[PDB]
Amino acid sequence: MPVLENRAAQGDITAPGGARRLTGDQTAALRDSLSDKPAKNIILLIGDGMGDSEITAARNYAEGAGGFFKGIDALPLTGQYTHYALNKKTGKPDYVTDSAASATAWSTGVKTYNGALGVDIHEKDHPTILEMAKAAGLATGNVSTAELQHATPAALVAHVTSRKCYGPSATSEKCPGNALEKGGKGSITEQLLNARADVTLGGGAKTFAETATAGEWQGKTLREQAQARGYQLVSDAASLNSVTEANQQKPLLGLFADGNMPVRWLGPKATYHGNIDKPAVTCTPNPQRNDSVPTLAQMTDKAIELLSKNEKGFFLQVEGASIDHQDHAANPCGQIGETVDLDEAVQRALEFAKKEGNTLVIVTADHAHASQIVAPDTKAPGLTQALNTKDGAVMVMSYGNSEEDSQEHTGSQLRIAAYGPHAANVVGLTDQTDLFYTMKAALGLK
Amino acid sequence: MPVLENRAAQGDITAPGGARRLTGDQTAALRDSLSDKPAKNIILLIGDGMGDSEITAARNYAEGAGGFFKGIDALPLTGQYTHYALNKKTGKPDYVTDSAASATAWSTGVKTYNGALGVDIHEKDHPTILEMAKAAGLATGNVSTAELQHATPAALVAHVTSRKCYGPSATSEKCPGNALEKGGKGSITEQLLNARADVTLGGGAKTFAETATAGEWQGKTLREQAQARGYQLVSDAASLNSVTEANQQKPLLGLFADGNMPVRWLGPKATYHGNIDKPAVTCTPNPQRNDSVPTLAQMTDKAIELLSKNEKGFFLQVEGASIDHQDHAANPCGQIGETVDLDEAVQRALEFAKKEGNTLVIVTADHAHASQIVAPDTKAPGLTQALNTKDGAVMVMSYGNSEEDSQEHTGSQLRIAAYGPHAANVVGLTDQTDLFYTMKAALGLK
Ligand SMILES: [Zn+2]
Ligand SMILES: [Zn+2]
Ligand SMILES: [Zn+2]
Ligand SMILES: [Zn+2]
Ligand SMILES: [Zn+2]
Ligand SMILES: [Zn+2]
Structure with a gap:
């Protein structure tokens, strides 16, 4: 192939x-x-x-x-x-x-509904592809550049009526029925710890400082609970590289940032008439992206390496998170840099998949966003910015679907690409829920 | 297939x-x-x-x-x-x-460059897929809901430095090098008449009233020229239906409107805070769409019928034009109605193509546009409108990439779908120029 x-x-x-x-x-x-x-x-x-x-x-x-x-x-x-x-x-x-x-x-x-995690409109739990993959005996990975409490990574391991129920504190208040001290399954974070994926890498180390309100680990910070449960914790690239085993007995939990991990590129925010009143921007790399902070591609490579020790096979979800944040923030350079960041990760996945020959790789997005590529001399009512592309020409980007602080998502259907066994199932028009069935069948998950 | x-x-x-x-x-x-x-x-x-x-x-x-x-x-x-x-x-x-x-x-x-028709950045002419198909002996059709002088249909038969050079008048002024009286090939319309496609259906009958500035038909209106050249003219659905032959000897030229053909659906223009201050809109069919005016699907069916008499085969380009116009105009109903209109035409092509077994059907767009689907409670800086969908729910559409009269085009890559022999060539990432080579090869054009 x-x-x-x-x-x-x-x-x-x-x-x-x-x-x-x-x-x-x-x-x-x-x-x-x-x-x-x-x-x-x-x-x-x-x-x-x-x-x-x-x-x-x-x-x-x-x-x-x-x-x-x-x-x-x-x-x-x-x-x-x-x-x-x-x-x-x-x-x-x-x-x-x-x-x-x-x-x-x-x-x-x-x-x-919007805001839900792992439950239907009747707030009823439904098993996730990860939980199912794990039950079947396959290695599981959950990687992302955002806080692990964030919607995308959380969706594979938690079931709450609201994405806002990060740790015990918020949960008790916003998700009463899920509150541990009220007989629920716990917050997103507490459920993450329960789910026990083999490899989990992301940010959001701050939330792990909260203390559980009930159960075996009441009074203990979620970080402590993680340690006591057998999770091997790593907080930087060096330590991540020292990891050799990542299994159900010694599961890996990497926390590389208090919140979301650093953006790869810096650049100013889009502005009203920015392509007219202001000079073209050339993005610059973030000095704080660090050598101690593993890149998305690095995390992906490690997850693949560790998860590939499992004879059964593995399920790995990798998320290039900050594309969405920087799009909301109307910051072209941040948005683009995170897309380039993701590209690298896709490459690692494609390289392994090509050699292994039995790996289905799928690259897609959860939903469309605001940014539009408009003509250089455009006078738009929103925020715009002119950029110096590799072509030595200028490209103007626009965000004009919100007068408020954050630019919003859009409903347009969007690309989904795949490679490997069962990739044919992404061709033509399909629904996002079809992807669940495609992955489950491809994996023969039962 | x-x-x-x-x-x-x-x-x-x-x-x-x-x-x-x-x-x-x-x-x-x-x-x-x-x-x-x-x-x-x-x-x-x-x-x-x-x-x-x-x-x-x-x-x-x-x-x-x-x-x-x-x-x-x-x-x-x-x-x-x-x-x-x-x-x-x-x-x-x-x-x-x-x-x-x-x-x-x-x-x-x-x-x-932007504004050019059938010429490169050095203003050099290049033969079109239609001219090539004709040279090879295939029947050719050029159907559209816009004026035939419009960029899309014109591109297949005219070669001018500016799309603005509709008839003799504008040409002499804006396209000196193409002006007939100055030794050029003539205006878009004059070249259309020379090109001599077997079937050409669209609007823009007004422009045909201009008189040629030179040549065999100097002083004669382009309409009269058409008649003297042997073109069988039809101006309504009844007469279009009476047509039995459409060939090089008796080519068909249908002009069903002074300008662009009537929009299918009526509805109000989007407006500032329209989804907030105004009630949801339910589109209403245009009373003036007429029974005397053939629909895009009807024109398509006729073109296929007449073009299918040719033993060699045929090339037919059909355009759902007003999607772009109504998008510029920020009129959701007009935009959607024209997309529903095009859907019907795609169906007729698919039906024939399925029975014939050797027809490559391709459905795509020349470029992306402004309209975005945003959340109901969105407060956008541009024009917005709430619509009552078939789902009995409300959808808000937004246009905010221009403070001026017309909303602009956007640069995003977009869908291209195909069916039949050589359709594989549209899969994955490709460039618009690739479509030329795909069609030429599929047709074995030489
Ligand atoms: Zn995310
Ligand atoms: Zn978002
Ligand atoms: Zn998202
Ligand atoms: Zn057009
Ligand atoms: Zn346009
Ligand atoms: Zn166009």
């Missing part, structure tokens, strides 16, 4: 055939990309808010319009999927989902 | 698996959708400005979130392609293309 080695402009963009990405008929290559045998492993790469627009903006800036993302764009089977949520009261569709309801849709196969 | 007969939510959206669009593994069906034998015919359906956002908004409103477009969504092979244009002075990419440069890209295989 081949991966598109190169879909970049073949030559001089100004000449006939120069901007072509294909070099011949693709029929045969596509025939070789189709396989229905079981998938032994599954790596799900999620770019939060990485719609088609976000991918194009990132490509234009970092690789050039005629460029090609060695990871994101290398997947052969492509399609578009819907991610509408449901209104809790009416059961009718809610065209623009949040990160919680969408994550639940692909992790459980059931639609839900 | 099968077409997705149903990719709608299989059941109760609120229950597990209820929102799924798939009923089983798609590997086999996809393997049956792959074929490399020659395509005897080609039907290219273009939705002007019909990006992924536009398609979703139209589906949500007309069919429901869990709904399915029997035409637009029925195509099995899908992917995403780029449509950046070029800066005339520098040769560097211009991330947001106009309707002219994009149409030129797929019709000639060479990128060009």
Whole structure:
């Protein structure tokens, strides 16, 4: 099964055939990309808010319009999927989902309301693909650049009526029925610890400082509970690299930041008439991204290495989180840098998947976002910014779907690409909940 | 070769698996959708400005979130392609293309600057897929809901330095080098008449009233020229239905409107805080759409019928034009109605293509647009409107990328779907210029 080695402009963009990405008929290559045998492993790469627009903006800036993302764009089977949520009261569709309801849709196969994690509109729990993979004996991984309490990673291990129920404190107040001291299963964090994935890497070390309100570990900080339960904790890249075992007996919990991990690129925020009144921006790397902080690609590589020791196979979800945050923040450079960041991780996954031959890799996003690529001389009512792309030309990005502090999500259907056994199931129009069924069947999960 | 007969939510959206669009593994069906034998015919359906956002908004409103477009969504092979244009002075990419440069890209295989038709950045002419198809002996059709002088349909038959050079008058002034009286090939309209496609259906009958400034038909209106050249003219649905022959000897020229043909649905324009201050809108069919005016689907069916008499095969380009116009106008109802209108036309093409067995059908857009689907309670800086969808729920659409009169195009890559021989060539990431080579090869054009 081949991966598109190169879909970049073949030559001089100004000449006939120069901007072509294909070099011949693709029929045969596509025939070789189709396989229905079981998938032994599954790596799900999620770019939060990485719609088609976000991918194009990132490509234009970092690789050039005629460029090609060695990871994101290398997947052969492509399609578009819907991610509408449901209104809790009416059961009718809610065209623009949040990160919680969408994550639940692909992790459980059931639609839900905005803000929900692992439960339907009737607040009923549903087993996640991770819980199922684990029950079947497969190694499980949950990686992300955001706080592990964040919607995307949480959705695979917690079941709460509200994404806001991070630790004991918030839970008791906002999620009474889930409150441990009220007979519930506990907060997102407490449930994360219970779920016991083999590898869990992300940020949000601050929340682990809270103390449990009940149970065996009442009075103990969640960090202490983690230690007492057998979790091997790592907080930097050096220690992460020293890890050799990651199993049910010695599960790994990496906390590399108080909150979300540092953004890769710095750049100013978009501004009213920014492409007109202000000079073009060139993004600069974040001096604080550190050498002590592992990159998304590094975390992915480690998770793969450790999870691959399991004879049964593994399920790994990797999230390029900050694309969504920086999109909300209307910060082009942050948004793009996180997309480039994700690309690298996709590459690692594709490299392993190609050698192993029985790995289904899927790259997609939970929902679309605000950013739009508009003409240079655009006078928009929102925030805009002009950037100096790799092409030596200027690209203007716009965010104008909110007068408030944060730019909002959008409902547009978006790309989903895959590679390996059962990838055909992402082609054409599909729903986000179909992804749950695709992964479960590919893994023969039962 | 099968077409997705149903990719709608299989059941109760609120229950597990209820929102799924798939009923089983798609590997086999996809393997049956792959074929490399020659395509005897080609039907290219273009939705002007019909990006992924536009398609979703139209589906949500007309069919429901869990709904399915029997035409637009029925195509099995899908992917995403780029449509950046070029800066005339520098040769560097211009991330947001106009309707002219994009149409030129797929019709000639060479990128060009915004505003150009059938020429590269050095203003050099390049033969179009239509001119080539004709030269090879195939029947050719050029259908659209806009004026035939419009960029999309014009791109297949005219070569001018500016899309503004509609008739003799504008040409002499804006395109000196193309002006007939100055030794050029003539205006867009004059060149259309020379090109002599077998079937050409659209609007823009007004422009045909201008008089030629030179040549054999100097002093004669372009309409009279058409008649003297042997073109059989029709101006309504009754007469269009009476047509039995459409060939090089008796080519058909249908002009069904002074300008662009009537919009299918009426509704108010989006407005500032419209989803807040104003009531939800239910689109209403345009009373003036008429029974005397053929619909896009009717024109398509006639073109296929007449073009299918040709033993060699045919090339037909059909355009759902007003999607773009109504998008500029920030009129949700007009935008969606035109997408529903195009869906019907895609259905007729799919039906024929399925029976014939050797027809490559392609449905795509020249570039993305402004409209975004945002949350109901959104307070946006632009124009917004709440709509009553088929789901009995409300969807809010937003346009906020321009403070000026018209909302602008956007640079995001967008969907391209195909069906039939050589459809595999649209899968994955590709460039718009690749479509030229795909069609030429599929047709074995030489
Ligand atoms: Zn999200
Ligand atoms: Zn996220
Ligand atoms: Zn978000
Ligand atoms: Zn256009
Ligand atoms: Zn058009
Ligand atoms: Zn336009």
